[PDB]
PDB file of C-alpha atoms and ligand atoms in Angstrom:
ATOM      1  CA  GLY A   1     -40.086   8.098 -19.117  1.00  8.95           C
ATOM      2  CA  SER A   2     -36.641   7.166 -17.759  1.00 10.81           C
ATOM      3  CA  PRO A   3     -34.539  10.243 -16.821  1.00 11.12           C
ATOM      4  CA  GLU A   4     -31.563   7.992 -15.853  1.00  8.92           C
ATOM      5  CA  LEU A   5     -31.748   6.361 -19.283  1.00  6.67           C
ATOM      6  CA  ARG A   6     -31.858   9.788 -20.958  1.00  6.56           C
ATOM      7  CA  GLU A   7     -28.770  10.922 -19.072  1.00  5.56           C
ATOM      8  CA  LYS A   8     -26.852   7.680 -19.633  1.00  3.75           C
ATOM      9  CA  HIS A   9     -27.582   8.228 -23.354  1.00  4.21           C
ATOM     10  CA  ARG A  10     -26.389  11.841 -22.992  1.00  4.99           C
ATOM     11  CA  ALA A  11     -23.147  10.967 -21.180  1.00  4.04           C
ATOM     12  CA  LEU A  12     -22.281   8.223 -23.651  1.00  4.51           C
ATOM     13  CA  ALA A  13     -23.014  10.507 -26.618  1.00  3.98           C
ATOM     14  CA  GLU A  14     -20.572  13.086 -25.162  1.00  3.55           C
ATOM     15  CA  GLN A  15     -17.795  10.452 -24.970  1.00  5.92           C
ATOM     16  CA  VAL A  16     -18.540   9.383 -28.541  1.00  2.00           C
ATOM     17  CA  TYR A  17     -18.129  13.048 -29.530  1.00  2.46           C
ATOM     18  CA  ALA A  18     -14.882  13.550 -27.621  1.00  2.00           C
ATOM     19  CA  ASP A  19     -13.171  10.434 -29.115  1.00  2.00           C
ATOM     20  CA  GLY A  20     -14.289  11.231 -32.632  1.00  2.00           C
ATOM     21  CA  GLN A  21     -12.846  14.725 -32.241  1.00  2.00           C
ATOM     22  CA  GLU A  22      -9.472  13.371 -31.002  1.00  2.00           C
ATOM     23  CA  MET A  23      -9.529  10.954 -33.925  1.00  2.00           C
ATOM     24  CA  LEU A  24     -10.416  13.712 -36.350  1.00  2.00           C
ATOM     25  CA  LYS A  25      -7.117  15.408 -35.454  1.00  2.00           C
ATOM     26  CA  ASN A  26      -4.942  12.321 -36.003  1.00  2.00           C
ATOM     27  CA  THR A  27      -4.068  10.862 -39.382  1.00  2.00           C
ATOM     28  CA  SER A  28      -4.218   7.347 -38.000  1.00  2.00           C
ATOM     29  CA  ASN A  29      -5.595   6.250 -34.619  1.00  2.00           C
ATOM     30  CA  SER A  30      -4.761   3.251 -32.450  1.00  2.00           C
ATOM     31  CA  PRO A  31      -7.159   0.276 -32.802  1.00  2.00           C
ATOM     32  CA  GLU A  32      -7.802   0.955 -29.129  1.00  2.00           C
ATOM     33  CA  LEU A  33      -9.079   4.534 -29.711  1.00  2.00           C
ATOM     34  CA  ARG A  34     -11.140   3.392 -32.698  1.00  2.00           C
ATOM     35  CA  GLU A  35     -12.678   0.575 -30.689  1.00  2.00           C
ATOM     36  CA  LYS A  36     -13.641   2.735 -27.672  1.00  2.00           C
ATOM     37  CA  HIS A  37     -15.398   5.102 -30.090  1.00  2.00           C
ATOM     38  CA  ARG A  38     -17.197   2.110 -31.617  1.00  2.00           C
ATOM     39  CA  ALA A  39     -18.105   0.443 -28.365  1.00  2.00           C
ATOM     40  CA  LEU A  40     -19.329   3.753 -26.909  1.00  2.00           C
ATOM     41  CA  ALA A  41     -21.432   4.326 -30.051  1.00  2.00           C
ATOM     42  CA  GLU A  42     -22.998   0.876 -29.591  1.00  2.00           C
ATOM     43  CA  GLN A  43     -24.075   1.826 -26.097  1.00  2.00           C
ATOM     44  CA  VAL A  44     -25.567   5.138 -27.280  1.00  2.00           C
ATOM     45  CA  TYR A  45     -27.605   3.228 -29.896  1.00  2.00           C
ATOM     46  CA  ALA A  46     -28.705   0.675 -27.325  1.00  2.00           C
ATOM     47  CA  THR A  47     -29.820   3.190 -24.631  1.00  2.00           C
ATOM     48  CA  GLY A  48     -31.620   5.232 -27.222  1.00  2.00           C
ATOM     49  CA  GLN A  49     -33.593   2.200 -28.432  1.00  2.00           C
ATOM     50  CA  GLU A  50     -34.431   1.344 -24.807  1.00  2.00           C
ATOM     51  CA  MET A  51     -35.952   4.817 -24.566  1.00  2.00           C
ATOM     52  CA  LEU A  52     -38.571   4.033 -27.212  1.00  2.00           C
ATOM     53  CA  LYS A  53     -39.686   1.004 -25.108  1.00  2.00           C
ATOM     54  CA  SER A  60     -42.243  15.323 -30.746  1.00  2.00           C
ATOM     55  CA  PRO A  61     -42.644  11.881 -32.442  1.00  2.00           C
ATOM     56  CA  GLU A  62     -41.551  13.376 -35.769  1.00  2.00           C
ATOM     57  CA  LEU A  63     -38.293  14.642 -34.175  1.00  2.00           C
ATOM     58  CA  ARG A  64     -37.619  11.227 -32.585  1.00  2.00           C
ATOM     59  CA  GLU A  65     -38.207   9.659 -35.997  1.00  2.00           C
ATOM     60  CA  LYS A  66     -35.690  11.965 -37.680  1.00  2.00           C
ATOM     61  CA  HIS A  67     -33.077  11.374 -34.897  1.00  2.00           C
ATOM     62  CA  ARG A  68     -33.509   7.558 -35.105  1.00  2.00           C
ATOM     63  CA  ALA A  69     -33.309   7.534 -38.898  1.00  2.00           C
ATOM     64  CA  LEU A  70     -30.170   9.769 -38.796  1.00  2.00           C
ATOM     65  CA  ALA A  71     -28.445   7.652 -36.089  1.00  2.00           C
ATOM     66  CA  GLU A  72     -29.066   4.572 -38.211  1.00  2.00           C
ATOM     67  CA  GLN A  73     -27.369   6.077 -41.209  1.00  2.00           C
ATOM     68  CA  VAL A  74     -24.418   7.232 -39.126  1.00  2.00           C
ATOM     69  CA  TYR A  75     -24.036   3.787 -37.582  1.00  2.00           C
ATOM     70  CA  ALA A  76     -24.145   2.086 -40.994  1.00  2.00           C
ATOM     71  CA  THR A  77     -21.583   4.632 -42.360  1.00  2.00           C
ATOM     72  CA  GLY A  78     -19.296   3.834 -39.427  1.00  2.00           C
ATOM     73  CA  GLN A  79     -19.549   0.061 -40.036  1.00  2.00           C
ATOM     74  CA  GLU A  80     -18.207   0.668 -43.553  1.00  2.00           C
ATOM     75  CA  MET A  81     -15.298   2.490 -41.938  1.00  2.00           C
ATOM     76  CA  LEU A  82     -14.493  -0.526 -39.745  1.00  2.00           C
ATOM     77  CA  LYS A  83     -13.333  -2.478 -42.827  1.00  2.00           C
ATOM     78  CA  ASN A  84     -10.629   0.163 -43.479  1.00  5.22           C
ATOM     79  CA  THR A  85      -7.162   0.472 -41.932  1.00  5.37           C
ATOM     80  CA  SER A  86      -7.205   3.969 -43.275  1.00  7.13           C
ATOM     81  CA  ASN A  87     -10.304   6.157 -43.686  1.00  7.12           C
ATOM     82  CA  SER A  88      -9.865   9.131 -46.039  1.00  7.44           C
ATOM     83  CA  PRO A  89     -10.934  12.601 -44.739  1.00  2.07           C
ATOM     84  CA  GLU A  90     -13.463  12.282 -47.587  1.00  2.00           C
ATOM     85  CA  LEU A  91     -15.143   9.388 -45.696  1.00  2.00           C
ATOM     86  CA  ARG A  92     -14.498  11.162 -42.373  1.00  2.00           C
ATOM     87  CA  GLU A  93     -16.324  14.254 -43.678  1.00  2.00           C
ATOM     88  CA  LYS A  94     -19.550  12.427 -44.645  1.00  2.00           C
ATOM     89  CA  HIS A  95     -19.317  10.816 -41.174  1.00  2.00           C
ATOM     90  CA  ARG A  96     -18.891  14.114 -39.258  1.00  2.00           C
ATOM     91  CA  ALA A  97     -21.524  15.952 -41.277  1.00  2.00           C
ATOM     92  CA  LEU A  98     -24.193  13.274 -40.585  1.00  2.00           C
ATOM     93  CA  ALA A  99     -23.030  12.836 -36.991  1.00  4.63           C
ATOM     94  CA  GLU A 100     -23.538  16.580 -36.407  1.00  2.00           C
ATOM     95  CA  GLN A 101     -27.153  16.229 -37.505  1.00  3.89           C
ATOM     96  CA  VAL A 102     -27.685  13.404 -35.003  1.00  5.01           C
ATOM     97  CA  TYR A 103     -26.292  15.529 -32.131  1.00  2.75           C
ATOM     98  CA  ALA A 104     -28.380  18.510 -33.216  1.00  3.37           C
ATOM     99  CA  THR A 105     -31.745  16.718 -33.424  1.00  6.19           C
ATOM    100  CA  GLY A 106     -31.173  14.987 -30.076  1.00  6.54           C
ATOM    101  CA  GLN A 107     -30.384  18.324 -28.455  1.00  6.78           C
ATOM    102  CA  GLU A 108     -33.348  19.977 -30.222  1.00  6.47           C
ATOM    103  CA  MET A 109     -35.366  17.434 -28.251  1.00  4.31           C
ATOM    104  CA  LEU A 110     -34.146  18.851 -24.927  1.00  6.99           C
ATOM    105  CA  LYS A 111     -36.086  22.108 -25.464  1.00  4.77           C
ATOM    106  CA  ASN A 112     -39.303  20.050 -25.212  1.00  4.30           C
TER     107      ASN A 112
HETATM  108  C1  MH0 B   1     -34.398   5.714 -31.919  1.00  5.38           C
HETATM  109  C2  MH0 B   1     -33.709   5.645 -30.558  1.00  5.38           C
HETATM  110  C3  MH0 B   1     -32.471   6.500 -30.509  1.00  5.38           C
HETATM  111  C4  MH0 B   1     -31.304   6.285 -31.140  1.00  5.38           C
HETATM  112  C5  MH0 B   1     -30.979   5.060 -31.966  1.00  5.38           C
HETATM  113  C6  MH0 B   1     -30.412   7.356 -30.810  1.00  5.38           C
HETATM  114  C7  MH0 B   1     -29.093   7.539 -31.202  1.00  5.38           C
HETATM  115  C8  MH0 B   1     -28.180   8.549 -30.893  1.00  5.38           C
HETATM  116  N1  MH0 B   1     -28.501   9.645 -30.092  1.00  5.38           N
HETATM  117 FE1  MH0 B   1     -30.305   9.979 -29.123  1.00  5.38          FE
HETATM  118  N2  MH0 B   1     -31.059   8.251 -29.993  1.00  5.38           N
HETATM  119  C9  MH0 B   1     -32.332   7.742 -29.788  1.00  5.38           C
HETATM  120  C10 MH0 B   1     -33.265   8.401 -29.019  1.00  5.38           C
HETATM  121  C11 MH0 B   1     -33.203   9.571 -28.279  1.00  5.38           C
HETATM  122  C12 MH0 B   1     -34.240  10.173 -27.539  1.00  5.38           C
HETATM  123  C13 MH0 B   1     -35.641   9.624 -27.402  1.00  5.38           C
HETATM  124  C14 MH0 B   1     -33.776  11.339 -26.984  1.00  5.38           C
HETATM  125  C15 MH0 B   1     -34.505  12.298 -26.062  1.00  5.38           C
HETATM  126  C16 MH0 B   1     -34.810  11.710 -24.694  1.00  5.38           C
HETATM  127  C17 MH0 B   1     -35.871  12.407 -23.911  1.00  5.38           C
HETATM  128  O1  MH0 B   1     -36.276  11.714 -22.868  1.00  5.38           O
HETATM  129  O2  MH0 B   1     -36.299  13.501 -24.194  1.00  5.38           O
HETATM  130  C18 MH0 B   1     -32.375  11.433 -27.386  1.00  5.38           C
HETATM  131  N3  MH0 B   1     -32.058  10.345 -28.199  1.00  5.38           N
HETATM  132  C19 MH0 B   1     -31.433  12.431 -27.077  1.00  5.38           C
HETATM  133  C20 MH0 B   1     -30.106  12.624 -27.493  1.00  5.38           C
HETATM  134  C21 MH0 B   1     -29.192  13.725 -27.192  1.00  5.38           C
HETATM  135  C22 MH0 B   1     -29.477  14.826 -26.236  1.00  5.38           C
HETATM  136  C23 MH0 B   1     -29.467  14.383 -24.779  1.00  5.38           C
HETATM  137  C24 MH0 B   1     -29.353  15.498 -23.783  1.00  5.38           C
HETATM  138  O3  MH0 B   1     -28.573  16.420 -23.922  1.00  5.38           O
HETATM  139  O4  MH0 B   1     -30.157  15.347 -22.721  1.00  5.38           O
HETATM  140  C25 MH0 B   1     -28.017  13.452 -27.815  1.00  5.38           C
HETATM  141  C26 MH0 B   1     -26.754  14.304 -27.783  1.00  5.38           C
HETATM  142  C27 MH0 B   1     -28.187  12.242 -28.537  1.00  5.38           C
HETATM  143  N4  MH0 B   1     -29.470  11.737 -28.335  1.00  5.38           N
HETATM  144  C28 MH0 B   1     -27.271  11.626 -29.332  1.00  5.38           C
HETATM  145  C29 MH0 B   1     -27.357  10.441 -30.050  1.00  5.38           C
HETATM  146  C30 MH0 B   1     -26.328   9.830 -30.808  1.00  5.38           C
HETATM  147  C31 MH0 B   1     -24.902  10.338 -31.009  1.00  5.38           C
HETATM  148  C32 MH0 B   1     -26.808   8.688 -31.346  1.00  5.38           C
HETATM  149  C33 MH0 B   1     -26.033   7.763 -32.260  1.00  5.38           C
HETATM  150  C34 MH0 B   1     -26.161   6.305 -31.886  1.00  5.38           C
HETATM  151  C1  MH0 B   2     -16.371  14.401 -36.207  1.00  4.83           C
HETATM  152  C2  MH0 B   2     -16.011  13.589 -34.980  1.00  4.83           C
HETATM  153  C3  MH0 B   2     -16.814  12.321 -34.890  1.00  4.83           C
HETATM  154  C4  MH0 B   2     -18.008  12.156 -34.266  1.00  4.83           C
HETATM  155  C5  MH0 B   2     -18.754  13.252 -33.556  1.00  4.83           C
HETATM  156  C6  MH0 B   2     -18.415  10.801 -34.425  1.00  4.83           C
HETATM  157  C7  MH0 B   2     -19.573  10.191 -33.982  1.00  4.83           C
HETATM  158  C8  MH0 B   2     -20.084   8.918 -34.209  1.00  4.83           C
HETATM  159  N1  MH0 B   2     -19.342   7.923 -34.826  1.00  4.83           N
HETATM  160 FE1  MH0 B   2     -17.456   8.095 -35.560  1.00  4.83          FE
HETATM  161  N2  MH0 B   2     -17.453  10.113 -35.139  1.00  4.83           N
HETATM  162  C9  MH0 B   2     -16.466  11.035 -35.451  1.00  4.83           C
HETATM  163  C10 MH0 B   2     -15.338  10.679 -36.126  1.00  4.83           C
HETATM  164  C11 MH0 B   2     -14.883   9.450 -36.578  1.00  4.83           C
HETATM  165  C12 MH0 B   2     -13.656   9.174 -37.233  1.00  4.83           C
HETATM  166  C13 MH0 B   2     -12.615  10.206 -37.568  1.00  4.83           C
HETATM  167  C14 MH0 B   2     -13.596   7.828 -37.489  1.00  4.83           C
HETATM  168  C15 MH0 B   2     -12.516   7.041 -38.204  1.00  4.83           C
HETATM  169  C16 MH0 B   2     -11.312   6.711 -37.319  1.00  4.83           C
HETATM  170  C17 MH0 B   2     -10.093   6.244 -38.079  1.00  4.83           C
HETATM  171  O1  MH0 B   2      -8.972   6.244 -37.596  1.00  4.83           O
HETATM  172  O2  MH0 B   2     -10.361   5.796 -39.320  1.00  4.83           O
HETATM  173  C18 MH0 B   2     -14.830   7.268 -36.979  1.00  4.83           C
HETATM  174  N3  MH0 B   2     -15.604   8.279 -36.424  1.00  4.83           N
HETATM  175  C19 MH0 B   2     -15.234   5.952 -36.978  1.00  4.83           C
HETATM  176  C20 MH0 B   2     -16.421   5.373 -36.578  1.00  4.83           C
HETATM  177  C21 MH0 B   2     -16.779   3.991 -36.578  1.00  4.83           C
HETATM  178  C22 MH0 B   2     -15.857   2.883 -36.935  1.00  4.83           C
HETATM  179  C23 MH0 B   2     -14.789   2.626 -35.894  1.00  4.83           C
HETATM  180  C24 MH0 B   2     -13.491   2.320 -36.590  1.00  4.83           C
HETATM  181  O3  MH0 B   2     -13.258   2.645 -37.736  1.00  4.83           O
HETATM  182  O4  MH0 B   2     -12.638   1.666 -35.854  1.00  4.83           O
HETATM  183  C25 MH0 B   2     -18.041   3.907 -36.119  1.00  4.83           C
HETATM  184  C26 MH0 B   2     -18.800   2.632 -35.941  1.00  4.83           C
HETATM  185  C27 MH0 B   2     -18.502   5.210 -35.847  1.00  4.83           C
HETATM  186  N4  MH0 B   2     -17.480   6.110 -36.083  1.00  4.83           N
HETATM  187  C28 MH0 B   2     -19.716   5.585 -35.353  1.00  4.83           C
HETATM  188  C29 MH0 B   2     -20.153   6.791 -34.857  1.00  4.83           C
HETATM  189  C30 MH0 B   2     -21.436   7.093 -34.297  1.00  4.83           C
HETATM  190  C31 MH0 B   2     -22.664   6.184 -34.187  1.00  4.83           C
HETATM  191  C32 MH0 B   2     -21.403   8.406 -33.905  1.00  4.83           C
HETATM  192  C33 MH0 B   2     -22.526   9.172 -33.275  1.00  4.83           C
HETATM  193  C34 MH0 B   2     -23.297   9.988 -34.291  1.00  4.83           C
END
């Protein structure tokens, strides 16, 4: 319905992915790297929601995104996030990327 919105969502999601990768390498990350990830993620969530304003694929994406976001908020309370936590995060995050891309096919 909005191509510009779709692409904005896309570009932001790519930046979320790049930062998370960077962070995945490092054993502790500056509060500045962490916060860019988080603020980027908030804009992905917001643009996606704006897009709602296959239905079953959208529903699965949205549900998945929600769980990744909530997972991430737990991680914000931690100075240090174990690779155990970081694994559940990446796993789930991969599913969000996949389903959103599966939508591109159309
Ligand atoms: C429920 C609203 C919603 C939320 C929340 C949401 C959250 C997220 N998304 Fe994402 N996403 C939403 C709705 C969409 C739609 C509707 C589409 C397909 C747009 C279209 O016009 O076909 C989409 N997302 C598409 C995508 C695509 C593919 C875009 C492309 O290559 O053109 C990616 C990578 C993506 N998402 C990632 C993410 C990530 C990461 C999050 C984590 C916050
Ligand atoms: C596998 C790479 C990777 C990807 C992709 C990724 C994608 C996403 N993320 Fe997110 N994320 C990744 C790796 C991390 C790490 C490693 C950390 C913890 C940083 C640290 O130093 O403890 C993290 N993400 C941390 C977070 C945090 C908390 C920020 C903080 O602790 O300061 C949030 C809110 C978050 N994520 C959300 C999201 C969302 C939403 C997506 C989109 C699905």
